[PDB]
Design an enzyme around this catalytic site. Structure first.
Site, PDB file in Angstrom:
ATOM      1  N   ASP A 167      53.689  24.068  17.617  1.00  0.00           N
ATOM      2  CA  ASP A 167      52.505  24.902  17.773  1.00  0.00           C
ATOM      3  C   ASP A 167      51.218  24.086  17.576  1.00  0.00           C
ATOM      4  OD1 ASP A 167      50.548  27.042  17.624  1.00  0.00           O
ATOM      5  OD2 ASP A 167      52.115  28.370  16.784  1.00  0.00           O
ATOM      6  N   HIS A 182      53.933  31.984  28.375  1.00  0.00           N
ATOM      7  CA  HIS A 182      52.782  31.951  27.482  1.00  0.00           C
ATOM      8  C   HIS A 182      51.732  30.884  27.828  1.00  0.00           C
ATOM      9  CE1 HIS A 182      50.500  32.733  23.884  1.00  0.00           C
ATOM     10  NE2 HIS A 182      50.620  31.472  23.513  1.00  0.00           N
TER      11      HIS A 182
HETATM   12  C1  HEM Z   1      52.797  35.417  18.478  1.00  0.00           C
HETATM   13  C2  HEM Z   1      51.650  34.739  18.561  1.00  0.00           C
HETATM   14  C3  HEM Z   1      51.565  33.301  19.120  1.00  0.00           C
HETATM   15  C4  HEM Z   1      52.454  32.304  19.047  1.00  0.00           C
HETATM   16  C5  HEM Z   1      53.816  32.321  18.306  1.00  0.00           C
HETATM   17  C6  HEM Z   1      51.895  31.168  19.765  1.00  0.00           C
HETATM   18  C7  HEM Z   1      52.486  29.932  19.935  1.00  0.00           C
HETATM   19  C8  HEM Z   1      52.083  28.991  20.859  1.00  0.00           C
HETATM   20  C9  HEM Z   1      52.831  27.825  21.283  1.00  0.00           C
HETATM   21  C10 HEM Z   1      54.230  27.436  20.779  1.00  0.00           C
HETATM   22  C11 HEM Z   1      52.104  27.155  22.186  1.00  0.00           C
HETATM   23  C12 HEM Z   1      52.579  25.843  22.878  1.00  0.00           C
HETATM   24  C13 HEM Z   1      51.475  24.922  23.413  1.00  0.00           C
HETATM   25  C14 HEM Z   1      50.572  24.458  22.295  1.00  0.00           C
HETATM   26  O1  HEM Z   1      50.931  24.575  21.094  1.00  0.00           O
HETATM   27  O2  HEM Z   1      49.463  23.959  22.602  1.00  0.00           O
HETATM   28  C15 HEM Z   1      50.850  27.891  22.363  1.00  0.00           C
HETATM   29  C16 HEM Z   1      49.799  27.572  23.185  1.00  0.00           C
HETATM   30  C17 HEM Z   1      48.624  28.241  23.388  1.00  0.00           C
HETATM   31  N1  HEM Z   1      48.291  29.518  22.951  1.00  0.00           N
HETATM   32 FE1  HEM Z   1      49.544  30.500  21.748  1.00  0.00          FE
HETATM   33  N2  HEM Z   1      50.667  31.531  20.281  1.00  0.00           N
HETATM   34  C18 HEM Z   1      50.445  32.840  19.903  1.00  0.00           C
HETATM   35  C19 HEM Z   1      49.345  33.607  20.200  1.00  0.00           C
HETATM   36  C20 HEM Z   1      48.269  33.250  20.981  1.00  0.00           C
HETATM   37  C21 HEM Z   1      47.109  34.086  21.201  1.00  0.00           C
HETATM   38  C22 HEM Z   1      46.860  35.503  20.629  1.00  0.00           C
HETATM   39  C23 HEM Z   1      46.274  33.439  22.000  1.00  0.00           C
HETATM   40  C24 HEM Z   1      44.944  34.106  22.402  1.00  0.00           C
HETATM   41  C25 HEM Z   1      44.145  33.512  23.275  1.00  0.00           C
HETATM   42  C26 HEM Z   1      46.869  32.135  22.325  1.00  0.00           C
HETATM   43  C27 HEM Z   1      46.381  31.107  23.106  1.00  0.00           C
HETATM   44  C28 HEM Z   1      47.015  29.895  23.366  1.00  0.00           C
HETATM   45  C29 HEM Z   1      46.463  28.787  24.128  1.00  0.00           C
HETATM   46  C30 HEM Z   1      45.074  28.719  24.792  1.00  0.00           C
HETATM   47  C31 HEM Z   1      47.530  27.688  24.144  1.00  0.00           C
HETATM   48  C32 HEM Z   1      47.496  26.296  24.827  1.00  0.00           C
HETATM   49  C33 HEM Z   1      47.192  26.444  26.324  1.00  0.00           C
HETATM   50  C34 HEM Z   1      47.408  25.152  27.086  1.00  0.00           C
HETATM   51  O3  HEM Z   1      48.569  24.629  27.090  1.00  0.00           O
HETATM   52  O4  HEM Z   1      46.407  24.651  27.688  1.00  0.00           O
HETATM   53  N3  HEM Z   1      48.091  32.064  21.680  1.00  0.00           N
HETATM   54  N4  HEM Z   1      50.878  28.997  21.543  1.00  0.00           N
END
Ligand code: HEM
Ligand code: HEM
Ligand code: NI
Lengths: 310, 310
Positions: free
Chosen positions: B146, B219
């Protein structure tokens, strides 16, 4: 040749205390976990070694023992003896199983508790769960350094581990637990000089008070106990602070290992029932006990090779 | 030459998230804490440097802003916009103050949180309090690394810190929070391949799925946003796991800093409402949001030299 569990642990900044009760007919699922628990510790823990220092000490309650194992019992294993003091009460609460999980980081403790509870799910009911964090300088929730006079290494072993007195269970130990909650507002209103009269040591410097300055009703005084001969009896404590700030919960999770329960129990009677020249431990004027239970933590050899169910 | 709060932090193992609401006529006490909060952070944290890494980002809600301060408002500050999608709902919940407390030890967080709440006592009412821990390999409760595609340094500041666009408030930021709870059982029943199509990166090696492969409802795809120009729109997240193993709670606490709420809000919309090409974020089929709030985290300067009350 019996291996004890990690009752003597290094210093570990994190801990999870799990206390559960065994449901109706959950005896079998439990005994399966009891075998694997050593292996499970190894699985969560082996990567992230040697820093991690993840361990688990598993304990079994008096009544739970009889439901679980045939064969002989540990010599001094009973249920927690409730103390109804004149002012303060050491309550006794339900627990059949104890898991004393510790590591250098709280996530390791959490991962292992998840494994244990995952496989126990459906056979046990949670009674207590607290996550402890140690302060960066070994101080507890009251601000005093906690653990100084703990027996160390070789004498710790002799003070904590069952021997020839109960050969059948040598390598085991008796664990006592109490979850305490503090009246922090009250305690912090005191001068530091008044607080040292409560504990029995200097706060910051951590030096014990000389024999005639240390009040008879101070904590350090009441918890010093001697045998019938000229020799003092000690236990092994791994106190862990805990809390929720919103709920105004500021705690000390007490845990104390001993070769026989009678030592810990003596200290408990002196603190709660008091002595002739001490109505009770002043630490109790600021600390209220909300649970207490007693367990036998076996040799790790005992858990690998269980007895047949009664 | 206005110093921002510690929005861009190092990597920290521990975190406490406080959300409180301000009671009737609590405004004065709150202001007094705001003026002293940087001071208190230093008090708790300095004797732990450098390794402590204790910091607090303080954030203020849209409604609470008008109760507390005369003068200008931040340009983007409104209440968290509830999202009521076809399948999943992004709940909006009560919250006037945010205290995002981070350090390397959980005890450093707890201590600052204690001081803050002790000051705020009588004037606020706890709304949410989460203690977060981070795994040793930066993974979350879903077992994926994450934080990988988070921005860094120059790019991060540009993405996160309010600039000339709103000069009275340069150095500030907008924080969005959501507490998520996971159907861990459901989740762990997928294959690793299945789980990767939910996230959009390979689980064990953290390589992002190639363009052809990456599902449009994964996601990573749904939170990958571009502006009205060619370039990408980023936010800074410091997601933290938390949990209770007894009551079977396994969660992720989301916190998302941006230069303007619009970016974060857009992402939140694609996730919960959908796309031409996707019903919703697959991650929501395993994660339920239980709180939501939006706060403005001012420049450090602003809190120390507060505007007049209205
Ligand atoms: C259950 C809630 C969430 C979990 C478990 C979670 C977990 C993760 C994981 C594993 C990644 C993989 C890529 C990285 O770490 O960069 C990620 C990316 C990302 N998440 Fe989440 N996240 C959650 C909620 C959210 C929320 C609410 C937003 C609201 C905008 C968000 C926005 C993003 C963005 C912008 C990325 C990276 C995008 C890219 O690769 O350019 N996430 N998240
Ligand atoms: C809220 C609960 C408790 C707190 C905050 C607390 C704290 C302390 C502190 C600060 C010391 C200073 C000396 C040292 O660490 O060596 C100490 C010593 C000690 N405590 Fe406690 N304690 C608690 C409960 C208990 C309980 C329930 C027992 C039951 C047997 C116990 C047994 C002892 C013993 C045997 C010593 C050292 C005795 C000696 O100096 O020879 N403690 N504790
Ligand atoms: Ni008293």
């Amino acid at each position: 040749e019996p291996e004890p569990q990690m009752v003597l642990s290094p210093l570990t900044s994190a801990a999870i205390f799990l206390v559960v009760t065994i449901d109706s007919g959950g005896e079998d699922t439990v005994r399966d976990l009891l075998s694997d628990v050593a292996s499970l510790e190894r699985a969560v823990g082996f990567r992230a070694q040697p820093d991690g220092r993840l361990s688990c000490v598993t304990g079994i309650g008096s009544e739970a023992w009889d439901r679980l194992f045939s064969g002989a019992r540990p010599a001094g294993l009973h249920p927690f003896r409730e103390l109804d003091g004149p002012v303060h009460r050491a309550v006794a609460t339900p627990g059949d199983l104890l898991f004393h999980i510790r590591a250098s980081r709280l996530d390791l403790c959490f991962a292992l508790a998840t494994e244990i509870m995952g496989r126990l799910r459906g056979a046990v009911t949670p009674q207590d769960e607290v996550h402890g964090f140690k302060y960066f300088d070994e101080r507890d929730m009251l601000g005093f350094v906690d653990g100084t006079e703990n027996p160390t290494g070789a004498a710790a072993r002799r003070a904590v581990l069952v021997g020839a007195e109960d050969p059948a269970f040598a390598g085991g130990s008796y664990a006592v637990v109490q979850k305490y909650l503090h009246d922090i507002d009250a305690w912090e209103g005191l001068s530091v000089e008044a607080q040292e009269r409560v504990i029995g040591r200097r706060k910051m410097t951590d030096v014990e008070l000389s024999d005639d300055v240390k009040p008879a009703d101070s904590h350090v005084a009441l918890t010093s106990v001697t045998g019938p001969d000229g020799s003092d009896l000690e236990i092994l404590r791994d106190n862990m602070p805990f809390g929720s700030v919103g709920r105004e919960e500021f705690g000390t999770y007490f845990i104390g290992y001993a070769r026989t329960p009678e030592v810990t129990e003596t200290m408990l009677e002196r603190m709660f029932l008091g002595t002739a020249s001490a109505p009770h431990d002043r630490i109790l004027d600021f600390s209220t006990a909300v649970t207490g239970s007693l367990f036998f933590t076996p040799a790790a050899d005992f858990l690998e090779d269980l007895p047949a169910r009664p």
